[PDB]
Design a protein around this nucleic acid. Sequence first.
RNA 1: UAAGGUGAUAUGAACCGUUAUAACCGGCGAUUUCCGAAUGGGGAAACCCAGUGUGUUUCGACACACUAUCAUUAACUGAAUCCAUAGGUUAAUGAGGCGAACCGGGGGAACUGAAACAUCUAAGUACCCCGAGGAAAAGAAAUCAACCGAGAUUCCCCCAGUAGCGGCGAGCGAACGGGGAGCAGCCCAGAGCCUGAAUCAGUGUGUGUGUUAGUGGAAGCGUCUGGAAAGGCGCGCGAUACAGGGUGACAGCCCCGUACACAAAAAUGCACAUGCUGUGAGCUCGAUGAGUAGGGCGGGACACGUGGUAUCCUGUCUGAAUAUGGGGGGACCAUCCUCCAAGGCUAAAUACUCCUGACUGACCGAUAGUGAACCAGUACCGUGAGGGAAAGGCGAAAAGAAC
Lengths: 46, 101, 77, 61, 102, 50
Amino acid sequence: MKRTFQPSVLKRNRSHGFRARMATKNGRQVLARRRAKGRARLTVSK
Amino acid sequence: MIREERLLKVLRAPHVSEKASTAMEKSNTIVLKVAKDATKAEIKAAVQKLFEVEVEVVNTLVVKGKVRQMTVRSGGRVIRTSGRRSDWKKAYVTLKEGQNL
Amino acid sequence: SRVCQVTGKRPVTGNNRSHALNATKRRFLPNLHSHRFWVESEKRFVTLRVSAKGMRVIDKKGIDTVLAELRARGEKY
Amino acid sequence: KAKELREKSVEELNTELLNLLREQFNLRMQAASGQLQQSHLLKQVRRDVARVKTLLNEKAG
Amino acid sequence: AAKIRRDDEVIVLTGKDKGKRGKVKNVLSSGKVIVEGINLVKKHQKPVPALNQPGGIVEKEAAIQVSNVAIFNAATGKADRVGFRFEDGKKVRFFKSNSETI
Amino acid sequence: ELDENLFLAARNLHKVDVRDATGIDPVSLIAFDKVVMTADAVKQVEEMLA
RNA sequence: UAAGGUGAUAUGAACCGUUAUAACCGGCGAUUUCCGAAUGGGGAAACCCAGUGUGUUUCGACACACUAUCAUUAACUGAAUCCAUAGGUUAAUGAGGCGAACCGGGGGAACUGAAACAUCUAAGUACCCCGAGGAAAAGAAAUCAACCGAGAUUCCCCCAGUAGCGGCGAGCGAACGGGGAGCAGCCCAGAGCCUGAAUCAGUGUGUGUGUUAGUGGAAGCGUCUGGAAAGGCGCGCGAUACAGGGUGACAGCCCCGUACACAAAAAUGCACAUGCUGUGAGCUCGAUGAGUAGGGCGGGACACGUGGUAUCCUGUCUGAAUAUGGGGGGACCAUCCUCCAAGGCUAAAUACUCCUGACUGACCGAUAGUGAACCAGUACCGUGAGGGAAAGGCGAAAAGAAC
């Protein structure tokens, strides 16, 4: 059966990547929270 | 033109392997480790100047490093660590007719 | 936005109150209009978004005075 | 080392820098090829190069 | 500002070697010293043909606390404490019981 | 009065406390084995205690 | 400041140093890849592609600098269109982004309580957004009072759970006045006479005092048990030092310290004193903030839910007097009392702690205390936002077990 995760690097980066987070102020607020928590990986960007 | 300091930077080491030895003894080809950002023109100039040989052509590839695992002890306690070895660039330098080291 | 360029009037919020006193949020809007004003000194028409109150103010003070005020505030016209 | 280096001029400091860079390259080749029992020379030449171009940068105003 | 250097004749104050004397060989940064032939331990040396040999059981000096030794006066023949003072603009050590420079 | 000479000489003795006759407190009067008061201190303590 | 060093892992190797230019510590510099506001254009962060100059070249090419947007200002040029504006190019200056709480402002719930629920409550709370500072805000009476008087703001304790508000239910809840902390008032709406006339900001020197490395510090031995003495026993000594920590068991006198007394090439904070720079002083005449006060309509704020409703704000429509004038004194009127709106500035007492140092605890002691005593915001889980652990202890010393 087809499962929900159907990976694609281009779609991954376009949806949750660093430049996508930086494009809006809500996404920029996501990054600030993750910096405050001290996350080792800020985004899915790799 | 490439400055001499750049040339003294771009060459890292001869690369030793049986593929390298066979290449030298078959095709007059020299295998080196080079700076990861060294272009083929830079490698050509560096070999031609620092080794005093005449170069036919340069072929390059990037080698991805592997994950290496070993332990470090930190205050009377051994902890397992993991990390990736750094990437490096390999040059296949074909010599016209000269003899190298 | 819905801001008068002379008086600075802008939308404010308040309550709708029913006979049973149910309160729902509402908005009070300024009586904004776009008008071409004849500036005698500059021999041209200047268009400003003004409320009717601002138009009365222009009548009282003259267009040149309020244009000077707008320049002082940095407002662009 | 920095004293008599400071006594030299810009052109002499460039010649010294070039000589140190060639010496560094030769040492690197030696170390790679399994020679160079004297491993301490690498750091020595690295710090000499740093000193020389510190002096060079401070000569240029 | 150390009070114990390399060639100091010291006397052990505590620890199964009281009264023994020897020269300091090394001063470790952890506040410990190696004194010639006092704190002897028996090391079970594993064989390593690359650099050493079959190994066997060897005797080495083990480090001892600096607080556990005292500078030896050799004039009074006893342990002594050491202070600091300036002579000709130079810091020097002197025996506290004797006031003589070391 | 507070004598600085007396105060300094008593700092390092741990079972001795020097007080000012206005710094007396109920616990310290009970705690120490003996209480020594000068006559001036006695008069001052009377004045405080009426 | 130094007899030891080349961070941990770390053993080793190759070396550096021993009055002084080894290492270490502090001030000031230098270097400071790429991404990121990211700013030459682009982009799926850490990558792709340039343009214009300057210089170099072994003619292959190479090095360096600049080139974002917006705001303000200036120069140049320049449409319909004559003048002119709009527009365009180029310069100079500034901004931009991040960050814990505190602060001001623009918006603004519901659960809940009312033993149901709609007025009301929760609550102008949570939350979103904008902006600033070391604090912010407020602030120099169109204020109170009561026929006596006080004299700008802010904060604490009372007044007082009072007077009131209130499906007069649930609930909300003052002021007057009193005691304290702290405490300076000024300027424009304008001319003359005098005139830099102190003032306040900026800069430069000098002194003082801190901060950023440091220095010296004072005194114990014998013996018993014991693996080891700091313990027992005996006899001594220091104390402006018996805070604390370590050392083979519990040390004032073994060590590091502690009391106390000193120290700064250099960079800086704060006080003063000076030098200069803009500033303005003082006197006399004046002037005294209009689409404003007030009003009608709809809302909101005041403890105050429209009520008999004072006062404040204003979305909408109106609209004075202007010092022989105006505002307020809880509907309203008359007396008489008090103040002078429609322009501004202003320290202290007050709020907080991402962070730095010292000290403290009838606070915890590894299922506790931070989620995290440990390489933890990690492993792992989730597309993502996000969630999120478990895991400390050989011994005094590795002497960590040759054979």
